[PDB]
């Protein structure tokens, strides 16, 4: 089995020339004979549903059968690394998903995991509190201890200089990269903080919470000042993410909701996202289609959303067994991954033209 | 760092077209518009679209419509630009430029709803009744323009209306409907072709009724049940009403009272569409990219994809309803991007790719098509290669500069072609001489063919006899006892008149008729049975043929306030000079121009300041030469050509209401200058072409054909040209005849393989298949072209884990087949541009050529280092479920013994290497004799052995490297998304390294190398219509140490770029990095010093502010980086060219406001035009 992105890009480069827009494109007609005419995202840029993946590929499971928490792609798309509860990095291949290698990174369940903006470094945390740097060849580089309590989410500045780690003691500590130096601590959050995202331009740190009195706090990295308080949910904001454009704050909480916030206008509120019958705990934005995102659930629900539509575009209810922790799109938006709450990990690619969706999923 | 961007070829390829009033309400004009350039066409009767006005915009026209305001004498235009800009403009009389009525800036951060990346294009629609106009902004906002003569607009939030529209496939205004009803296609629940089990069909229609005064919007006639894939909607005209909605597979007619009638076209609506659809008999086709319009009522002409044209007839019952549809298969044509009915029986087919042409249709209910004159088009230039011409003559072989011309893969599909483009005309010299001491020359006709060649020495006069053998004449006739000022035919090629300073000798042939003696003479004009003679002191005498043939003296009654400097004569075969009529032109030394009616002698036209160069003239220094001539069909439109202070400036003429009803408009140039000899020499019928040759330090052929388009062609070979004459002989066909500066007379004929009607002289070579790549092979001098073909697909590959299994497609007979592409590699001969027979490499069944370059691998066979092979990387596209693998194909051209009767068959491919690689092959290069191939995420640098490639050194690169180039052991690479990874290959150790990369993500079309003395720039074009130059600067601190690149110059070009050339200078060591834009044109980048740069940056900031640009635009914000942090360092040489267009009364005002003299800037700008005169 395989899902090769190469015949889509070459068909896009041959259509790169004589196509002025997407209003000039010859339409893909729904039959099994029009398989060559698929172009990737970035080609058929409007019509964003495109790439709303609901075709199953493979369930990449380990031998040891440990539940996985964070799964992210290598930024060249060569391989999926997978963080599990036993501190093991299981590197999955990127086209023929079989196997590459198993590392042993931490002595704890691997909580946060992020790659650099360039291909250089990979920040990984754990449930004990240690933060290790990682080269692209998966070599262990210098380590330290960031927090005394389990670190739940990490993310760094719009350059490779400065990261922030949030943990279950309630502190969001902002770190230097090269010196491993604790610059300052962001206190005054109320309880344990479980998500942090840096802004791509402006230099913000947005933190979630379990505390209902102080659910979302905007922070400043340069000062230690809390910029703005934004109580938006009833209980326990799980994930907080930001677009690459920087205008939107997307929030996932335990109260069966996802909410869009404009960070320029915190008084009002953009649209809300119901339909998760259980908690939404893994929100992940789409890299090329700004304004759409995947959303997981704790019953295993996988839902795909789009900004402007009140209902959901399409997704899966009770398909994936267990919870869902985190999702990561490939750098091209064609295939999606997910960390299940059991001991597996499923890969999802777009529906082919002409097929009838009669399997266990979808219909 | 510091550069300038110039445009060498204006962009061709039309996107928009209409048929409206432009000049006046009486006649109608075809108004076509391409990438940032507007053309207005008349129509003469064969019928040949004549150009009337061409307009250059500083934007990229995104929509275009025309609505005639009440009270106005013309019809306005509504030009939609990028980032939401509407611009209502009209043609202006008086000044011939087009006036700007209104501007509407609609770019607001609160309108975009948080969406940064703009996908949707703005769309302008106007009413059929002409009540209001509408613009869809950003895909959400509707701007309504009610009908100084305007009314202030108001923006409709569409998601604040009923039914939550949320999209906009198309929107039109309907007919009938006293309120201007706007129909809107949309999808409330958007779905995707390939996902139809969960969303079967969702398209809807809201016909909104616009109240101008009340500003309320009631929804009437909602439908909600249309098929999932609907393309454009078309408003059915007035006696029927309603709307036809093109779907991809079906075709619908919709009306507010009639039940919905819709038929399917091809059997693909089986399990996808639940809308109640019939089965259209006979018809079998798909409407996915179709352009259509209505003949007057009940007939619709549809241009499908594939170029096929159908005529849909709406079968109308007695209730003015629709019963059914009728489809017929008429003639096939160009792959259109537009469609317009012109009057009755004439259709225009505007097309980006392919030649946009004019059709004629007559009845035969059933129609038949006749093709009128097409418009030549250089299409989407995909890859282009710089080659050398073949038949350059041996007289010109010792020129020091390289002699080379470009070959462009243009067009697509059935209109796929090669384009052989070239600058300055290289004449074929058939016979040369050496005639010293004589400088002027004339050819007269003695009894079609030119009889006498007349040379004027300083002391005497040479006469030559033509015929079988050209030979110098010895007998009486012309007086050889002195110089002759000018010799020309009088009458109609019957009687020859020469003029010496002493008298005006007539001549009928070998025998002089009579003699008439007249201050030293300088020039005389003898055109059109009137001979006007002018001496040095300002005296003017006129002659005239008088058949009883003897010329009498009629000195003009003139009251001289100052001395007459120069003269011209002109008459009107197809004339606009109203109030064959003869006209005398006279320029006095005080600075005025005076056009005289010639049989009488009265002042008709008067300009107060004729020198200078004022842009538009109206009635009431040191001019050298002035010539009025007509150019075009039946000598229609006249031109004024003057010579004022080493600066050519030519004027058109256009009609405008006891004086002349004309005014003169100045047109731009690229040409510069640095007894009396005439420099402006009018020629008729040289290779069928009429026009002017302009003598000087840089010669320029001025041509106007029946198109009416002005064509300036230089001639840089063989130095400056002193004199010139048209020449028609026996052994020489219709040709020409000129002196060299070294004193060599050259019998010459234009080369017949080109076509000089286009802005560059171009031979368009039809392939009738898509040209992908082209590569000049320097050894044996041929071109290797990868082409395609469109065959119906019939199999589906599967990967079962053991072997491949093909699945046979088996459907109904009423079913359309998918397109499978089979690529083959041609071999084109430059000698005659026919493809070489028995030389074609045909690839595999599913195989696609991803790259072709001329790769010089190293070999011990030659005495040099390299051989210059042709290497093609190619891989198989069999769907996403099959692993893509590639194959590197190395070919060399070998001269063999030719097949008898076919001299072109001396060349043939020999394949050295053809082996299937481990993965796809995406790009190829060369590095000191090493082939650099990019497979997957690895970039192997192979080495060529005796028969096989052996790998030396690779790295792991990013996602999909598609372009690579390299210069002296440094490779540059180009990703789809990560945009840059420049490499370095050390020689001794077999290792390849990554020097630096662009840390930002960026789309990339292709890359180049900007070359200065020591500064090596990395030019990148980037899908967002931009250009940017990255440099590797380790000592800089804003970059990280030797890892991050930094852009140093940013520039928003209007069009996409795939090709890149480098030519040498003629600027010690800086290469010009040419490029051919994908929307038709060809551009430049010329590096400059900082000192020359900032004198012109102060100029551009003055030229942007103080000049009334077209459509009220900002030339700065258009050339600002992206969309439509920016570090701009590239000048706008299309805006600096409007410094040359200013009069030198007004040129000195901007020079004082920036603080210099005007003569320095003219030295600054004209060195840019001089060094860039290649190709």
Q: DSSP readout, B191-233?
A: -BTTB-SS----BEEEEEE--TTT----EE-----B-S-EEEE
Name chain A contacts of B271, Cβ cutoff 8 Å.
356
CA distance B208 to B1025: 36
B346: left (phi over 0), alpha (psi -120 to 50) or beta: beta
Answer whether B956 touches A (CB < 8 Å). yes
The answer for B 1076-1095 residues in CB contact with A (under 8 A) is 1078
Q: Provide the residue count of chain B.
A: 1175
Name chain A contacts of B116, Cβ cutoff 8 Å.
245, 247, 290
A36: left (phi over 0), alpha (psi -120 to 50) or beta: alpha
Answer whether B286 touches A (CB < 8 Å). yes
CA distance B1096 to B898: 58
Answer whether A268 touches B (CB < 8 Å). no
Query: Which of B721, B732, B652, B735 lies closest to B689, judged by CA?
Result: B735
Across the interface, whether the CB atoms of A358 and B190 are under 8 A apart is answered no
Mapped onto helix, strand or coil, the DSSP state of residue A9 is helix
Answer whether A7 touches B (CB < 8 Å). yes
Burial track B372-402 (b if 16+ CB lie within 10 A, e otherwise): bebbbbbbbbbbbbbbeeeebbebeeeeeee
Q: Domain range for residue B128?
A: 3-375
User: How is residue B396 annotated by DSSP?
Assistant: G
Distances (CA, A) of B399 to B396, B402, B716, B719: 6, 8, 10, 9
Which residue of A lies nearest to B14 if distances are taken between CA atoms? A20
Torsion on CA atoms A145, A147, A151, A156, rounded to nearest 10:
-80
Query: Which of A65, A217, A237, A10 lies closest to B880, judged by CA?
Result: A10
CA A192 to chain B, closest CA, distance in angstroms equals 31
For residue B1024, what is the enclosing H or E element?
none
What six digits make up the tokens of B269? 């609506």
CA B796 to chain A, closest CA, distance in angstroms equals 7
Which residue of B lies nearest to A11 if distances are taken between CA atoms? B877
CA B1080 to chain A, closest CA, distance in angstroms equals 11
Query: Which of B449, B503, B450, B447 lies closest to B478, judged by CA?
Result: B503
Which residue of B lies nearest to A116 if distances are taken between CA atoms? B999
CA distance B442 to B459: 17
What six digits make up the tokens of B547? 């058949």
Best probe of the B interface among A3, A8, A31, A264, by most B CBs < 10 A, is: A31
Answer whether B792 touches A (CB < 8 Å). no
- Whether residue B1086 contacts residue B1074, with contact meaning beta carbons closer than 8 Å, is answered with no
Name chain A contacts of B268, Cβ cutoff 8 Å.
29-31
Mapped onto helix, strand or coil, the DSSP state of residue B83 is coil
Best probe of the B interface among A1, A5, A7, by most B CBs < 10 A, is: A7
Torsion on CA atoms B948, B954, B960, B962, rounded to nearest 10:
-60
Across the interface, whether the CB atoms of A47 and B190 are under 8 A apart is answered yes
CA distance B877 to B894: 31
Name chain B contacts of A15, Cβ cutoff 8 Å.
none
CATH number at residue B215: 2.130.10.10
- Whether residue B97 contacts residue B81, with contact meaning beta carbons closer than 8 Å, is answered with no
B822: left (phi over 0), alpha (psi -120 to 50) or beta: beta
Answer whether B248 touches A (CB < 8 Å). yes
Answer whether A178 touches B (CB < 8 Å). no
Which residue of B lies nearest to A361 if distances are taken between CA atoms? B198
Answer whether A177 touches B (CB < 8 Å). no
Query: Which of A155, A79, A74 lies closest to A119, judged by CA?
Result: A74
For residue B2, what is the enclosing H or E element?
none
Q: Pick B197's closest partner by Cβ from A3, A23, A362.
A: A362
Work out the angle between the directed axes of helices B1090-1105 and B1147-1154 (0-180°, nearest 10). 120
CA A254 to chain B, closest CA, distance in angstroms equals 26
CA B116 to chain A, closest CA, distance in angstroms equals 7
Across the interface, whether the CB atoms of B286 and A29 are under 8 A apart is answered yes
CA distance B1166 to A44: 45
Q: Which residues contact A282 (CB under 8 A, 6 or more apart)?
A: A238, A239, A252, A294, A295, A296, A324, A325, A326, A327, A338, A339
Name residue B804's beta-bridge partners: B799
Name chain B contacts of A11, Cβ cutoff 8 Å.
877
- Whether residue A41 contacts residue A333, with contact meaning beta carbons closer than 8 Å, is answered with yes
Across the interface, whether the CB atoms of B194 and A30 are under 8 A apart is answered yes
Query: Which of A196, A195, A188, A240 lies closest to A214, judged by CA?
Result: A188
Across the interface, whether the CB atoms of B189 and A332 are under 8 A apart is answered no
Q: Is B800 exposed, middle or buried (0-12, 13-18, 19+ CB in 10 A)?
A: exposed
Sequential DSSP letters for A264-323: S--SS---EE---SS-----EE-SSSTTEEEE--SSS-EEEEETT-SS-SEEESS-S-S-
Answer whether A142 touches B (CB < 8 Å). no
Distances (CA, A) of B533 to B439, B481, B539: 21, 20, 8
What six digits make up the tokens of A93? 């291949």
Best probe of the A interface among B848, B880, B1044, by most A CBs < 10 A, is: B880
Strand arrangement of the beta sheet that strand B357-363 belongs to: B340-342, B346-349, B357-363, B367-371
How many separate helices (H) and strands (E) can be counted in chain B? Answer: 4, 92
Mapped onto helix, strand or coil, the DSSP state of residue B129 is coil
Resolution limit, Å: 3.8
Q: Pick A45's closest partner by Cβ from B119, B194, B772.
A: B119
Across the interface, whether the CB atoms of B116 and A308 are under 8 A apart is answered no
Max Cα distance, chain A (Å): 60
Q: Is B642 exposed, middle or buried (0-12, 13-18, 19+ CB in 10 A)?
A: buried
Best probe of the B interface among A3, A11, A13, by most B CBs < 10 A, is: A13
CA distance B433 to B443: 16
How many CB atoms are located within 10 Å of the residue B484 CB? Answer: 24
Which residue of B lies nearest to A201 if distances are taken between CA atoms? B1125
Max Cα distance, chain B (Å): 104
């Amino acid at each position: 089995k395989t899902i090769d992105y190469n015949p889509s890009v070459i068909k896009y480069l041959e259509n790169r020339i004589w196509q002025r827009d997407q209003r000039d494109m010859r339409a893909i007609q729904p039959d099994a004979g029009y398989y060559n005419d698929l172009v990737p995202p970035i080609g058929m840029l409007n019509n964003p549903m495109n790439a709303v993946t609901t075709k199953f590929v493979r369930t990449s499971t380990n031998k040891v059968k440990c539940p996985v928490f964070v799964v992210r792609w290598t930024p060249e798309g060569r391989r999926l690394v997978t963080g599990a509860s036993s501190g093991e990095f299981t590197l999955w291949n990127g086209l023929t998903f079989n196997f590459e290698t198993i590392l042993q990174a931490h002595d704890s369940p691997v909580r946060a995991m992020t790659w650099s903006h360039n291909d250089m470094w990979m920040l990984t945390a754990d449930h004990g509190g240690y933060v290790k740097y990682w080269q692209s060849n998966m070599n262990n580089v210098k380590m330290f201890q960031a927090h005394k309590e389990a670190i739940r989410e990490a993310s760094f500045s719009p350059t490779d200089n400065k990261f922030a780690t949030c943990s279950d003691d309630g502190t969001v500590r902002i770190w230097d990269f090269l010196r491993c130096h604790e610059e300052r601590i962001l206190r005054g959050h109320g309880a344990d903080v479980k998500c942090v995202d840096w802004h791509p331009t402006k230099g913000l740190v947005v933190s979630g919470s379990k505390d209902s009195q102080q659910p979302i706090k905007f922070w400043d990295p340069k000062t230690g000042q809390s910029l703005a308080t934004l109580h938006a949910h009833k209980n326990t904001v799980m994930e907080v993410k930001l677009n690459l454009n920087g205008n939107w704050l997307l929030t996932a909480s335990r109260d069966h909701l996802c909410k869009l916030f404009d960070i320029r206008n915190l008084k009002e509120e953009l649209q809300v996202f119901r339909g998760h019958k259980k908690e939404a705990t893994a929100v992940a934005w789409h890299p090329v289609h700004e304004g759409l995102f995947a959303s997981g659930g704790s019953d295993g629900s996988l839902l795909f959303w789009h900004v402007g539509v009140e209902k959901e575009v399409g997704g899966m209810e009770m398909a994936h067994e267990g919870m869902i922790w985190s999702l990561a799109w490939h750098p091209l938006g064609h295939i999606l991954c997910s960390g299940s709450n059991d001991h597996t990990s499923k890969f999802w690619t777009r529906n082919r033209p002409g097929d009838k969706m009669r399997d266990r999923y979808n219909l | 760092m510091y550069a300038v961007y110039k445009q060498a070829h204006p962009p061709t390829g039309l996107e928009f077209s209409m048929y409206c009033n432009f000049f006046n309400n009486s006649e109608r004009n075809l108004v076509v518009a391409g990438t940032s350039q507007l053309y207005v066409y008349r129509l003469n009767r064969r019928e040949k679209l004549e150009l009337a006005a061409s307009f250059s915009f500083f934007g990229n026209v995104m929509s275009m419509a025309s609505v005639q305001l009440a009270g106005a004498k013309r019809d306005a235009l509504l030009l939609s630009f990028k980032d939401a800009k509407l611009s209502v403009v009209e043609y202006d009389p008086g000044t011939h430029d087009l006036k700007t009525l209104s501007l509407h800036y609609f770019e607001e951060p609160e309108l975009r709803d948080g969406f940064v990346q703009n996908v949707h294009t703005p769309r302008v629609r106007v009413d059929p009744d002409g009540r209001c106009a509408a613009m869809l902004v950003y895909g959400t906002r509707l701007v309504v323009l009610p009908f100084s003569s305007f009314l202030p607009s108001y923006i409709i939030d569409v998601r604040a209306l009923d039914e939550k529209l949320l999209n906009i496939i198309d929107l039109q205004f309907l007919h009938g409907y006293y309120e201007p009803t706007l129909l809107i296609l949309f999808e409330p629940n958007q779905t995707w072709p390939g996902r139809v089990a969960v969303r079967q069909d969702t398209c809807s229609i809201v016909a909104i009724s616009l109240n101008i005064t009340q500003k309320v919007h009631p929804v009437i006639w909602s439908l909600t049940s249309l098929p999932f894939d609907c393309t454009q909607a078309l408003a059915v005209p007035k006696p029927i009403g309603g709307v036809v909605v093109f779907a991809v597979n079906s075709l619908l007619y919709l009306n507010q009272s009639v039940p919905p009638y819709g038929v399917a076209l091809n059997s693909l609506t089986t399990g996808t569409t639940a809308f109640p659809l019939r089965t259209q008999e006979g018809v079998r086709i798909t409407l996915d990219c179709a352009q259509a319009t209505f003949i007057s009522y009940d007939k619709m002409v549809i241009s499908l994809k594939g170029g096929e044209i159908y005529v849909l007839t709406l079968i109308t019952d007695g209730m003015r309803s629709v019963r059914a549809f009728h489809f017929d298969k008429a003639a096939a044509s160009v792959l259109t991007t537009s469609m317009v009915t012109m009057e009755p029986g004439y259709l225009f087919l505007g097309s980006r790719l392919g030649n946009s042409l004019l059709l004629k249709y007559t009845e035969k209910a059933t129609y038949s098509f006749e093709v009128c004159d097409s418009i030549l088009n250089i299409g989407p230039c995909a890859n282009a290669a710089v080659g050398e011409p073949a038949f350059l003559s041996e007289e010109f072989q010792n020129s020091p500069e390289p002699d080379l011309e470009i070959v462009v893969c243009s067009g697509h599909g059935k209109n796929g072609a090669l384009s052989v483009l070239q600058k300055s005309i290289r004449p074929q010299v058939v016979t040369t001489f050496e005639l010293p001491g004589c400088y002027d020359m004339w050819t007269v006709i003695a009894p079609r063919r030119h009889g006498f060649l007349i040379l004027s020495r300083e002391d005497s006069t040479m006469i030559l006899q033509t015929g079988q053998e050209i030979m110098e004449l010895d007998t009486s006739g012309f007086a050889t006892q002195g110089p002759t000022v000018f010799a020309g035919n009088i009458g109609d090629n019957r009687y020859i008149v020469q003029v010496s300073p002493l008298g005006i000798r007539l001549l009928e042939g070998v025998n002089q008729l009579h003699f008439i003696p007249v201050a030293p003479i300088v020039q005389c004009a003898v055109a059109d049975p009137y001979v006007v003679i002018m001496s040095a002191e300002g005296h003017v005498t006129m002659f005239l043929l008088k058949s009883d043939h003897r010329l009498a003296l009629h000195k003009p009654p003139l009251h001289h306030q100052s001395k007459v400097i120069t003269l011209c004569l002109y008459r009107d075969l197809s004339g606009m000079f109203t109030t064959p009529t003869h006209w005398c032109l006279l320029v006095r030394e005080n600075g005025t121009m005076e056009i005289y009616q010639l049989p009488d002698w009265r002042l008709v036209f008067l300009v107060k300041n004729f020198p200078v160069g004022q842009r538009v003239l109206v009635d009431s220094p040191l001019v050298k030469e002035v010539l009025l001539v007509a150019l075009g069909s039946r000598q229609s439109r006249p031109y004024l050509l003057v010579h004022v202070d080493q600066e050519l400036l030519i004027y058109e003429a256009f009609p405008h209401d006891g004086n002349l009803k004309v005014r003169f408009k100045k047109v731009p140039h690229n040409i510069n200058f640095r007894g009396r000899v005439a420099r402006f020499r009018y020629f008729e019928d040289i290779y069928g072409y009429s026009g002017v040759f302009i003598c000087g330090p840089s010669p320029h052929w001025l041509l106007v054909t029946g198109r009416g388009a002005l064509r300036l062609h230089p001639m840089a070979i063989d130095g400056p040209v002193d004199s010139f004459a048209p020449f028609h002989n026996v052994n020489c066909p219709r040709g020409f005849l000129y002196f060299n500066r070294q004193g060599e007379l050259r019998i010459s004929v234009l080369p017949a393989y080109l076509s000089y009607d286009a802005p560059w002289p171009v031979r368009k070579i039809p392939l009738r298949c898509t040209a992908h790549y082209v590569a000049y092979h320097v050894e044996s001098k041929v071109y290797a072209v990868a082409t395609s073909t469109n065959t119906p697909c019939a199999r589906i590959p599967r990967m079962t884990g053991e072997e491949k299994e093909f699945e046979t497609i088996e459907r109904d007979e009423r079913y359309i087949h998918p397109q499978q592409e089979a690529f083959s590699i041609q071999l084109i001969s430059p000698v005659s541009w026919e493809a070489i027979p028995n030389a074609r490499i045909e690839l595999q069944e599913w195989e696609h050529v991803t790259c072709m370059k001329t790769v010089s691998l190293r070999s011990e066979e030659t005495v040099s280092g390299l051989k210059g092979y042709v290497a093609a990387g190619t891989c198989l596209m069999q769907g996403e479920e099959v692993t893509c693998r590639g194959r590197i194909l190395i070919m060399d051209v070998i001269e063999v013994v030719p097949e008898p009767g076919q001299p072109l068959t001396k060349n043939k491919f020999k394949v050295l290497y053809e082996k299937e690689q481990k993965g796809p092959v995406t790009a190829l290069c060369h590095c000191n004799g090493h082939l650099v191939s990019a497979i997957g995420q690895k970039i192997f640098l192979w080495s060529l052995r005796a028969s096989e490639l052996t790998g030396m050194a690779f790295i792991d690169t990013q996602l999909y490297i598609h372009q690579m180039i390299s210069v002296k052991n440094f490779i540059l690479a180009a990703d789809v998304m990560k945009s840059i990874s420049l490499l370095r290959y050390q020689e001794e150790s077999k290792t390849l390294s990554l020097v630096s990369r662009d840390a930002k993500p960026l789309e990339v079309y292709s890359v180049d190398f900007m070359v200065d003395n020591a500064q090596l720039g990395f030019l990148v074009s980037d899908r967002d219509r931009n250009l940017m130059v990255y440099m590797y600067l380790p000592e800089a601190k804003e970059s990280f140490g030797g890892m991050r690149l930094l852009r140093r110059a940013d520039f928003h070009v209007g069009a996409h770029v795939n090709t890149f050339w480098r030519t040498p200078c003629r600027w010690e060591n800086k290469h010009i990095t040419w490029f051919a834009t994908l929307d038709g044109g060809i551009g430049l980048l010329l590096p400059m010093q900082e000192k020359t740069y900032r004198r012109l940056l102060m100029l551009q900031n003055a030229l942007t502010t103080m000049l009334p640009h077209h459509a009220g635009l900002n030339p700065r914000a258009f050339r600002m980086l992206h969309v439509d942090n920016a570090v701009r360092n590239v000048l706008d040489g299309e805006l600096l060219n409007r410094y040359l267009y200013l009069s030198t009364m007004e040129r000195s005002e901007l020079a004082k406001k920036i603080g210099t003299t005007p003569d320095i800037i003219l030295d600054d700008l004209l060195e840019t035009d001089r060094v860039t005169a290649h190709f």
